[PDB]
């Protein structure tokens, strides 16, 4: 249920620009049918990456769960939502949500990848 020392990276195709709709033709993510329908606030308030990792079997029973992520580097932490898979190999719907906020200095953004840790959690919206 918990995973540490995983090399995370970020990748953007069509985010919030196209209201990051998980329904958008070339995306079609698992909980799109249920979360792409929530307004903007909530959606931009609570991040929404994927159910992946070397240790994260959580799909069918993950369409309404959240994921807490921590960054040893700063000690900062945040909570994202579980929605889709890892078409790239890990957390992708970031850029403004997780990475960008737990990266106070920018070391990750200028380099490309980072070493982070995470644990499955509740949303409590």
From Swiss-Prot:
Keywords of this entry: Disulfide bond, Lectin, Plant defense, Pyrrolidone carboxylic acid
A GO biological-process term: defense response to bacterium
Entry-linked InterPro entries: Barwin_CS, Barwin_dom, PR4, RlpA-like_sf
Molecular function per GO: carbohydrate binding; RNA nuclease activity
Residue ranges occupied by any Barwin domain in the UniProt entry: 2-125
Disulphide bonds in the chain: 31-63, 52-86, 66-123
Function per UniProt: May be involved in a defense mechanism. Probable plant lectin. Binds weakly a chitin analog.
Protein name in UniProt: Barwin
Organism: Hordeum vulgare
